[PDB]
Amino acid sequence: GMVEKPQLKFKSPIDNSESHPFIPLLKEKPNALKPLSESLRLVDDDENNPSHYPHPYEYEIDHQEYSPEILQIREEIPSKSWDDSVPIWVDTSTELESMLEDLKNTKEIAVDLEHHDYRSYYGIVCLMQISTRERDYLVDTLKLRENLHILNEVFTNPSIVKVFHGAFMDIIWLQRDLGLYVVGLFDTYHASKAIGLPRHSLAYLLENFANFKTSKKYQLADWRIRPLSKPMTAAARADTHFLLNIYDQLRNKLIESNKLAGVLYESRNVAKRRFEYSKYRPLTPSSEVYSPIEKESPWKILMYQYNIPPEREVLVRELYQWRDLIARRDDESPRFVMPNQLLAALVAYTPTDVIGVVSLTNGVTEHVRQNAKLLANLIRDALRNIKNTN
Ligand SMILES: O=c1ccn([C@@H]2O[C@H](COP(=O)(O)O)[C@@H](O)[C@H]2O)c(=O)[nH]1
Ligand SMILES: [Mn+2]
Ligand SMILES: [Zn+2]
């Protein structure tokens, strides 16, 4: 189908202006050790990062102690029979409240998310998966975007472990879109490594500790679609349904070899990661701060050198910033607006009129089509400031 952009229905309009450092959406702060007060402030300019807001839970992450039974070798609890229950779909404030209530009675929960980045500028969280020892929940993060902040009561309670596999981006996506933070994280990815298993992916873990062959076919899927296809629903459910058992086995092995503290330390840092707009990204890019990364050709003249002539660097760069503003304007992803191959094609063939732009051998996107004149004008200008100068 056409899949009506779900953003259009958000209670708060998206902003790609990037006119200010990223601000946490967190209006409340449970399981607090340091009042939300201090949190919302700033960290005025320095040589390692311009003004920015800090991670609203950085403190508690460092200062709050872990759940006792995490340091003990406990008997592993098998995942529950896939067929004994159906995944609970959550898309109402009521459906959401009963789950929260239910989540508060746990010692630990497994969590995962599905994200979309083709019809959005920064990207958006379309689905969230949460598993307890008894059931699997499927949360529509699109429809409950403005409500999911109440989950903090559980996600920040150090007395409930939260299991994620390689949550380095989940932590980011969670704050950026839902204002959710995580205190008491256990990353099965960092655990796999410490133990030294042949591979460290979730797929690997599922096949060897839960006999479940996974599918990469849904990491290109459009998680915006409603309802979700059975095969899609199953894949999402499979991401947290077996994680708590896998968690038990890894935690125990980590304990048995004196490597837990190391894994917990690694997890605390993944949880501490902060989301900041590219504009205000730290000078020295690291794993403590995450700034939007471009999924395509080098910033200017692409390295993919489709045999990109000398002078055409300016043309190329004008096309880039143009595509970015357009993407930021209609809140789309750069490749949707115009994929590099096309950017290249334009630069490579330098069409000077609308015909030339829309009949461009490779093919054309809607944005390129709906802006063919501006693009022909821009291209024609390049070809001219090239003939002039020298
Ligand atoms: O090769 C990949 C793997 C994952 N993802 C993104 O990560 C989300 C969660 O993937 P995972 O952490 O469950 O593997 C996906 O829904 C998708 O947005 C990708 O874009 N490409
Ligand atoms: Mn994931
Ligand atoms: Zn997943």
From Swiss-Prot:
One of its GO terms (molecular function) is single-stranded RNA binding. GO terms for cellular component: exosome (RNase complex); nuclear exosome (RNase complex); nucleolus; nucleus. UMP binds at E114, H115, W173, K216, Q219. Residues 88-254 form the 3'-5' exonuclease domain. Its EC number is 3.1.13.-. Transmembrane segments: none annotated. Zn(2+) binds at D112, E114, D239. Residues 309-389 form the HRDC domain. Disruption phenotype: Deletion mutant is temperature-sensitive. Impaired growth at 37 degrees Celsius. Impaired growth at all temperatures, nonviable at 37 degrees Celsius. Mutant is defective in the 3' processing of the 5.8S rRNA and accumulates a discrete species, 5.8S + 30, that is 3' extended by 30 nucleotides. Accumulates 7S RNA. Accumulates 5' external transcribed spacer (ETS) RNA. Accumulates extended forms of snR40 small nucleolar RNA (snoRNA). Accumulates U24 + 3 snoRNA. Accumulates poly(A)+ snoRNAs. Mn(2+) 2 binds at E114, D239. Present with 2160 molecules/cell in log phase SD medium. Belongs to the exosome component 10/RRP6 family. This is Exosome complex exonuclease RRP6. It comes from Saccharomyces cerevisiae (strain ATCC 204508 / S288c) (Baker's yeast). The gene is RRP6. The chain holds residues 129 to 516 of 733 of the full protein.
